């Protein structure tokens, strides 16, 4: 049928530009044949298909490639990611809803929907009458909406009794103070 | 953090190519090979940073070049078709009457050719639809997301239709509010 070629570059940053690693993958369909890994220092053949390339590139493009760690990785991070990606702050919306139709003293589940936030770092906690809940809390993975915002659903297994106050507590960099939402039976 | 400055994918036959920049897993932009422009997902970013599309074109031309060379090297080993798997979920919490966006996340795509469309009450939708480029996966397959703007109501039910060579028949992922 068809044939595919993929070229995938990766600039891995740690502690800002304190540690930058550059990995470049050359792939045929789904087989990576030759890879440049700055931790290694030169191109390498992953499979036989890469020998015709590794050999030659280490002679004519080694230094050019190594320099991209500064000319591309660091340059992009400091000069373009800095004023855009790294400055993006989107506050999470938090709302609680009950899974099953209410009926006091009957087991149920509270769903805290924390949505539309960026970046990914976030902390979501459940409290019941001022005490933090742990064992009965479950969560989805961090969901990437694909539009530069995430969402996550945190559930609490509970039994609504009169007078109780259930609180979903969210902490995020875009927030000076935590966002809390209460639900009373 | 992780920046992928120049993901370049080329496919034959058809002369299908894609050039994108991803940061922390999100799409910074893709270069429209035909119009020869850098298309930023967040339009405001194009005000604080810029990329010359030529770099995109050039990298694609090279992708094309390395495809012939590699196709010959494998003795023309065609790409295996995979079965794409779709998941539908709302962007915001569902509220009767409140404008929202349904998201169709399709993973394990390979090769990078697919049709992702929407059906509302079993009929095809045209307006309010947008789609991302293919994102790379650790296993070298791709993922893609489609978007449908909509208002939650009692009568409307939806489907994300995925048509791919690895699927005997277009698959429908059903979704309806509560």
């Amino acid at each position: 049928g068809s044939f595919v070629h993929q070229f995938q570059p990766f600039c891995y940053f740690t502690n800002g530009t304190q540690r930058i690693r550059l990995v470049i993958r050359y792939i045929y369909n789904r087989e990576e044949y030759v890879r440049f890994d700055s931790d290694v220092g030169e191109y390498r053949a992953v499979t036989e298909l890469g020998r015709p390339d590794a050999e030659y590139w280490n002679k004519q493009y080694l230094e050019r490639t190594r320099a991209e760690l500064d000319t591309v990785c660091r340059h992009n991070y400091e000069k373009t990611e800095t004023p855009t990606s790294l400055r993006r702050l989107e506050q999470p919306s938090v709302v609680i809803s009950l899974s099953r139709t209410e009926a006091l003293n009957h087991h149920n589940t509270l769903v805290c929907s924390v949505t539309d936030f960026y970046p990914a770092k976030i902390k979501v906690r459940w409290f019941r009458n001022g005490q933090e809940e742990t064992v009965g809390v479950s969560s989805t993975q961090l969901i990437r909406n694909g539009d530069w915002t995430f969402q996550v659903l945190v559930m609490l297994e509970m039994t609504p009794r009169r007078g109780e106050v259930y609180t979903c507590h969210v902490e995020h960099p875009s927030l000076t103070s935590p966002i809390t939402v209460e639900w009373r039976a | 953090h992780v920046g992928s400055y120049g993901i370049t994918v080329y496919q034959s036959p058809g002369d299908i190519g894609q050039y994108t920049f991803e940061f922390d897993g999100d799409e910074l932009f893709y270069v429209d090979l035909d119009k020869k422009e850098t298309v930023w997902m967040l339009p405001e970013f194009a005000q604080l940073r810029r990329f010359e599309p030529q770099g995109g074109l050039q990298n694609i031309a090279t992708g094309k070049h390395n495809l012939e060379i590699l196709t010959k090297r494998s003795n023309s080993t065609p790409a295996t078709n995979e079965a794409p798997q779709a998941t539908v979920f709302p962007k915001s919490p569902v509220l009767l009457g409140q404008p929202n966006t349904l998201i169709c996340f399709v993973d394990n795509i390979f090769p990078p050719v697919i049709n992702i469309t929407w059906l509302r009450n079993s009929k095809s939708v045209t307006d309010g639809v947008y789609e991302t480029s293919f994102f790379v996966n650790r296993d070298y397959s791709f993922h893609k997301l489609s978007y449908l703007t909509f208002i939650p109501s009692d009568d409307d039910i939806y489907d994300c239709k995925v048509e791919h060579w690895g699927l005997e028949e277009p698959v429908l992922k059903h979704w309806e509010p509560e």
């Binding site: 991209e68 | 940073r49 010359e52």
Partner: peptide, 16 residues
């Protein structure tokens, strides 16, 4: 203004 660059995919050798 703010110029963005990418990585440069390199060509591969032939024959031999």
């Amino acid at each position: 203004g703010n110029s963005h660059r990418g990585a440069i995919e390199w060509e591969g050798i032939e024959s031999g």
